[PDB]
């Protein structure tokens, strides 16, 4: 698994998920 | 598992999760 | 498991979790 | 398990958790 | 288990936990 | 278990815990 | 400006205003 | 500016205003 | 500016204003 | 500026204002 | 500036103002 | 500036102002 | 002999065996 | 012989065996 | 012989055996 | 012989055996 | 013979055997 | 013979056997 984020100026986000029964 | 974040100026976040029965 | 965060200027965060029955 | 945080200027945090029955 | 934090200027924190029945 | 903190200038903290029945 | 990201709402009943509102 | 990230609300009943509001 | 990150609210009843509010 | 990070609220009843408020 | 990090509130009833407030 | 870190409040009833307040 | 009379079940999720069983 | 009369169950989650059982 | 009369159960989570059982 | 009459259970979590049991 | 009449249980967590039991 | 009448239990946590038991 990998996530990464280069230089920005403003709002950013990552709600990435995995798995079952998240409900 | 890996996460990482380069230079920024402003709001950023990562709610990445994994696993079951999160409900 | 790994997390890491390079130079920034402002708000950042990581609510990354794993496991079951989080409810 | 590992966590780490390079030079910053401002607010940062990590609420990373693992385990079950967090409720 | 490991945690670590390099030079900063301002607010930082780590509420990382593990274990069950946290309630 | 390990925790550690390099040179800083300002507020930092670690509420890292482990174990059950924390309630 | 606002964000409403990443929510998981497992169950809701008889409720008002559970989401991002402004102005 | 605000964020509403990462919430898990397992159950809610008979409630008002459970999310990000402004101005 | 504010953040509402990482919350887990297991159960809530008959309540007002459980989330990030401003101005 | 404020943060509301990492909370776990297991159960709440008949309550007002359980989250980050400002101005 | 303030932080509201890491709280675990197991149970709450009939209460006011349990979280980070300012100005 | 203030912090509200690491609290565990097992049970609370009929209460006011249990968290970080300022100005 | 048994009876299962008069029930009102407002909401149910992810459940087993909510009704009259025997032998 | 048994009875299961008059119940009102407002909300239920992730549960086993909420009703009249015998032998 | 038993009775299970008149119950009001406002909310229930993650529970076993909340009702009339015998033999 | 037993009775389970008149109960009001406002909220319950993570519990076993909250009702009338016999033999 | 027994009775379980008139109870009001406002909140309960993580509990066993809160009701009328026999033989 | 026994009675369990009139109880008001405002809050209970992590408990065993709070009600009328016999034989």
From Swiss-Prot, chains A, B, C, D, E, F, G, H, I, J, K, L, M, N, O, P, Q, R:
It is found in: Secreted. It comes from the Eukaryota. The modification Tyrosine amide is found at residue 23. Amyloid fibrils are degraded by insulin-degrading enzyme IDE. Can form homodimers. Interacts with IDE and INS. Interaction with INS inhibits homodimerization and fibril formation. IAPP is the peptide subunit of amyloid found in pancreatic islets of type 2 diabetic patients and in insulinomas. Belongs to the calcitonin family. The mature protein is largely unstructured in the absence of a cognate ligand, and has a strong tendency to form fibrillar aggregates. Homodimerization may be the first step of amyloid formation. Amylin/IAPP is a glucoregulatory peptide hormone that plays an important role in the regulation of energy homeostasis. Selectively inhibits insulin-stimulated glucose utilization and glycogen deposition in muscle, while not affecting adipocyte glucose metabolism. IAPP function is mediated by the CALCR-RAMPs (AMYRs) receptor complexes. Amylin can also bind CALCR receptor in the absence of RAMPs, although it is more selective for AMYRs. This is Islet amyloid polypeptide. It comes from Homo sapiens (Human). The gene is IAPP.
């Amino acid at each position: 698994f990998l996530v990464h984020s280069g230089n920005n100026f403003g709002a950013i986000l990552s709600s990435t998920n995995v798995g079952s029964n998240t409900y």
